[PDB]
Every structure is written in C-alpha cells, then in structure tokens.
Design a protein around this ligand. Sequence first.
Ligand SMILES: *[C@@H]1O[C@H](CO)[C@@H](O[C@@H]2O[C@H](CO)[C@@H](O[C@@H]3O[C@H](CO)[C@@H](O[C@@H]4O[C@H](CO)[C@@H](O[C@H]5O[C@H](CO)[C@@H](O[C@@H]6O[C@H](CO)[C@@H](O)[C@H](O)[C@@H]6O)[C@H](O)[C@@H]5O)[C@H](O)[C@@H]4O)[C@H](O)[C@@H]3O)[C@H](O)[C@H]2NC(C)=O)[C@H](O)[C@H]1NC(C)=O
Ligand SMILES: *[C@@H]1O[C@H](CO)[C@@H](O[C@@H]2O[C@H](CO)[C@@H](O[C@@H]3O[C@H](CO[C@H]4O[C@H](CO)[C@@H](O)[C@H](O)[C@@H]4O)[C@@H](O[C@@H]4O[C@H](CO)[C@@H](O)[C@H](O)[C@@H]4O)[C@H](O)[C@@H]3O)[C@H](O)[C@H]2NC(C)=O)[C@H](O)[C@H]1NC(C)=O
Ligand SMILES: *[C@@H]1O[C@H](CO)[C@@H](O[C@@H]2O[C@H](CO)[C@@H](O)[C@H](O)[C@H]2NC(C)=O)[C@H](O)[C@H]1NC(C)=O
Ligand SMILES: OC[C@H]1O[C@@](CO)(O[C@H]2O[C@H](CO)[C@@H](O)[C@H](O)[C@H]2O)[C@@H](O)[C@@H]1O
Ligand SMILES: [Fe+3]
Ligand SMILES: [Zn+2]
Ligand SMILES: [Zn+2]
Length: 341
Amino acid sequence: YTRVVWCAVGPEEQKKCQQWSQQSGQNVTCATASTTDDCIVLVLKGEADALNLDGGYIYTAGKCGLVPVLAENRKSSKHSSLDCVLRPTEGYLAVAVVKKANEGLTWNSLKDKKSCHTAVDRTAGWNIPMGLIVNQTGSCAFDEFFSQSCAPGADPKSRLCALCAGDDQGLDKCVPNSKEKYYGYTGAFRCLAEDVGDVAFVKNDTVWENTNGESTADWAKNLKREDFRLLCLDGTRKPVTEAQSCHLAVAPNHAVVSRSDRAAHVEQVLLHQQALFGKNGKNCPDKFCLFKSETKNLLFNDNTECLAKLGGRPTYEEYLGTEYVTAIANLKKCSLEACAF
Ligand SMILES: *[C@@H]1O[C@H](CO)[C@@H](O[C@@H]2O[C@H](CO)[C@@H](O[C@@H]3O[C@H](CO)[C@@H](O[C@@H]4O[C@H](CO)[C@@H](O[C@H]5O[C@H](CO)[C@@H](O[C@@H]6O[C@H](CO)[C@@H](O)[C@H](O)[C@@H]6O)[C@H](O)[C@@H]5O)[C@H](O)[C@@H]4O)[C@H](O)[C@@H]3O)[C@H](O)[C@H]2NC(C)=O)[C@H](O)[C@H]1NC(C)=O
Ligand SMILES: *[C@@H]1O[C@H](CO)[C@@H](O[C@@H]2O[C@H](CO)[C@@H](O[C@@H]3O[C@H](CO[C@H]4O[C@H](CO)[C@@H](O)[C@H](O)[C@@H]4O)[C@@H](O[C@@H]4O[C@H](CO)[C@@H](O)[C@H](O)[C@@H]4O)[C@H](O)[C@@H]3O)[C@H](O)[C@H]2NC(C)=O)[C@H](O)[C@H]1NC(C)=O
Ligand SMILES: *[C@@H]1O[C@H](CO)[C@@H](O[C@@H]2O[C@H](CO)[C@@H](O)[C@H](O)[C@H]2NC(C)=O)[C@H](O)[C@H]1NC(C)=O
Ligand SMILES: OC[C@H]1O[C@@](CO)(O[C@H]2O[C@H](CO)[C@@H](O)[C@H](O)[C@H]2O)[C@@H](O)[C@@H]1O
Ligand SMILES: [Fe+3]
Ligand SMILES: [Zn+2]
Ligand SMILES: [Zn+2]
C-alpha cells in the first residue's frame, strides 16, 4: 500500500524527486519520463502513481480515466479564516505580456509577431490564447498566425519551434520539459525578457515573481515590472498591476492526478508528506521543502502554499469547469470523445 511512485518530467524534476524520495524514507519513489504525456501513460499503466498537472493536461488525463486528488493552493487575502488545506482554490489569471518599449503592440496587432508559449496543450500558454485566436480568426491555421514562436511540444522543424533554444548544448530543442530554455511559465517569460519573442502567454504571478529583484536569476535581476504591459481583449494595454481587469481568462489551479483506484492512497500519503515538507513543515526550511526549486517550478509551482482537498469529490470535468472544458473541445476540433492512446 502506503508507498507512492511520483512521475518526474525531465532530468531536473527527477533529481528533485530523488531528494524528496530520500528524505521521505522511501515513502515516495520516483519514475521519470521525457514528457508529461509519457508520465500520464506510466500512470495509466500503473508503473507510476501520480504527478501534478496543468489544467490542459488534466483534460487529457481525464479522458483516460485519471482523476484530480488535490489541487495547488497559493496564499490569498480573502478566505483567511480557513486553513490552507480546507480553503477553496481561486484559480490563476491567464495574461499576455509584452515589453512596454514595444509601443503600438496590442491584442489586435499580434498577427505575424513572435510568440512565447509555456508549452503546447497548457492552459495559459496555449489553450486559452490559441482558442481565442482560432475563434476571432475563424480558421484552424493557428500554426500560421505567428511568424515564429517557441511552443514546446510542437514539431521541432516547424515555425512553432523556431524560437526555442534547447539545453546548454543546444540539444532537446523544443522538448516539453525544463531542459528547454524557454519551457513553462518561467521559460516563456524569459523568452520575452530576452526579446526573443514579442509576446509571452503565461500567468499573472509569473511577471511578479521574476521582476523587481524577486528572482536573483542572472536574466531577471534587472527586470522591472514597469517595463512590461498586459494586453487586454479590448485592444488596450495596461500595467501588470491591473491584471484583475485585463486578463484573457481565469484558469483552474494545477492539480495532482492519479488513477481512480489509487486516489485515496495517494491523497493520504501527500497530506502527510506536506505536513513534513510543506510550507510550515516539520522539516522544510531545515531539511527539504517540497515547494521550492529556485523559481524553476519543479514538481510544484514555487508559489504553492499547500495542496488542498477538493470538496464535492469533483470529476475532472467538474474540476476544470464547463466554461474551460468547452473551450478545449472547440480548439481540439482543429487538430470527438477518445483517450489519446
Ligand atoms: C498577481 O500575482 C502576484 C504574485 O503572485 C500577486 O501578488 C502577491 O500577493 C500576495 C498576497 O495576495 C503577496 O503576499 C502577501 O504579502 C504581504 C506583504 O509582504 C504579507 O504580509 C501581511 O500578511 C497579513 C496576513 O495575511 C496581511 O493581512 C491580510 O488580512 C488582513 C485581515 O484579514 C487584511 O488587512 C487589512 O489591513 C487594513 C489596513 O490597515 C485594515 O484597515 C483592514 O481592516 C484589513 O484588516 C488584508 O486582507 C490583508 O491582506 C497583511 O495585509 C500583509 O499582507 C502577506 O502575508 C502575504 O505574504 C505577495 O507578496 C504578492 N506577490 C508579489 C510578487 O508582490 C498579485 O496580487 C496577483 N494579482 C492579482 C490580480 O491577483
Ligand atoms: C470559441 O468559440 C466557440 C464557439 O462559439 C465557443 O463555444 C462556446 O462557449 C460558450 C461559452 O463558454 C458556451 O456557452 C453556452 O451557454 C448556453 C446558456 O447556458 C448558460 O447560460 C445560462 C443563463 O445565462 C446559465 O444559467 C447557465 O448556467 C449557463 O452558463 C448553454 O446552454 C444551455 O443549457 C441549459 C441547461 O440548463 C438549457 O436549458 C439551455 O436551453 C441551453 O441549451 C450552452 O450549453 C453553452 O454552454 C457554448 O456552449 C460553446 N459552444 C460550443 C459549440 O461548444 C468557445 O467557448 C470559444 N472558446 C474560447 C476559448 O473562448
Ligand atoms: C513513512 O510513512 C509511515 C506511515 O505513515 C510513517 O510512519 C508513521 O510515522 C508517524 C510519525 O513518526 C508515527 O506516529 C506512526 O506511528 C508511524 N507508523 C504508521 C502510522 O504506520 C513515517 O513517518 C513516514 N516517513 C517519512 C520520513 O515521511
Ligand atoms: O463554482 C465552481 C465549483 O463548483 C463545482 C461543483 O462543486 O463545479 C460546478 O461548475 C462546473 C463548471 O461549469 C460544472 O461542470 C459542474 O457540474 C458544477 O457542479 C466545482 O467543481 C467548482 O470548483
Ligand atoms: Fe498552467
Ligand atoms: Zn475575468
Ligand atoms: Zn460531482
């Protein structure tokens, strides 16, 4: 029973998982894959137990029977009376970020520009923006909208990968894992910060966490929030301080998923695990902290306060919501009930 196998995506999450495994006295063990899709297959096969996912993948994993167990919960101002684990999730804001110095660039003049996406199939980095674009465009040719981009998970030979850089030696170009320089929230923001792309599709928090001395990372040390602007749907540009009134959509928090027949056992282990390495864990600051990885968001976003119970034992459809689910469906129509394997 009680031993849980976690699936790490890429060499960086593997090493973090191994530390976790070590400190957990084998209560947690690691399996590794080169992509989130592969990890999902390992979980379906039962060679793995769970992994934390972005809404976009939860849709995929859901169709194949996997279920949401616990969701990430970040520190919020409202609902302060309830404990983190019992507190309702609020979701994150999907935004489009651009350089202020790139005057004249608005949501209505994105065509033929350069884009930076977290990775194909993710919420803020792909489903939301590309979905809105396919609608407003009335075409399924989202592979021709931008001139060049870096969208991890696309054909390496396509313009959708043209801007990706791969690893320190140039290998793994465009792979959907942290080996790729511009992968995920941080990678997509860096892609913008280094003026590789004209626009980055990440989440509100990504801009705050990597500006004004919050990162210390060689490429973000001198980044100032004021040099950035948010593209709203009404064609307007606003400061990153107005995200509540200028976002593309609100996305459901990343959540841990396992097979339905194992969720109970995974839920038990995780709660006890975070009691030890969580934010105010018995051994987090001193020995190991599940939610830290120096702005790299490994296994879990670095801004996670705790993993929270769901309440209402929601199916994957109920967890993502009808709004979002229909959006992905309509966008999928471009690339009707299935399980991709
Ligand atoms: C976009 O993404 C950004 C990054 O994720 C995000 O900014 C992040 O927001 C969080 C909070 O949501 C910030 O962390 C907070 O920082 C403060 C300052 O360091 C911390 O210090 C205090 O902690 C208190 C306890 O929670 C907090 O009290 C809260 O609750 C009280 C009462 O319940 C209440 O206080 C009010 O005070 C009034 C003035 O006197 C008083 O008259 C009134 O009666 C009332 O009681 C407030 O509700 C209050 O929030 C204190 O206020 C302090 O916060 C705090 O613990 C927490 O760590 C992050 O720093 C920030 N990130 C960055 C990079 O800055 C944006 O908000 C996101 N944007 C959107 C649209 O969501
Ligand atoms: C890209 O573009 C596509 C094409 O437009 C778009 O697809 C659609 O998204 C919209 C919004 O997400 C879907 O909206 C619909 O609203 C109908 C009305 O029901 C809502 O409104 C009620 C009153 O305001 C609310 O009380 C209710 O809670 C709900 O919010 C829905 O229909 C009904 O079901 C009722 C059952 O009680 C019934 O009684 C009614 O007669 C009615 O049939 C409807 O089902 C729908 O949700 C719309 O469905 C989507 N269309 C398709 C074809 O899937 C994408 O959203 C868009 N993508 C992006 C990223 O923007
Ligand atoms: C590995 O899992 C086991 C099972 O929970 C833990 O052993 C329990 O630990 C607590 C705290 O020491 C004791 O109160 C229980 O009596 C133990 N036995 C049970 C309930 O089986 C152990 O703490 C975990 N190890 C690590 C390092 O996380
Ligand atoms: O209010 C959102 C909250 O409600 C739940 C049920 O407790 O889901 C509801 O909203 C979904 C989104 O449209 C529906 O698909 C679902 O049937 C409905 O119950 C939670 O899952 C969600 O967090
Ligand atoms: Fe996401
Ligand atoms: Zn909104
Ligand atoms: Zn239900």
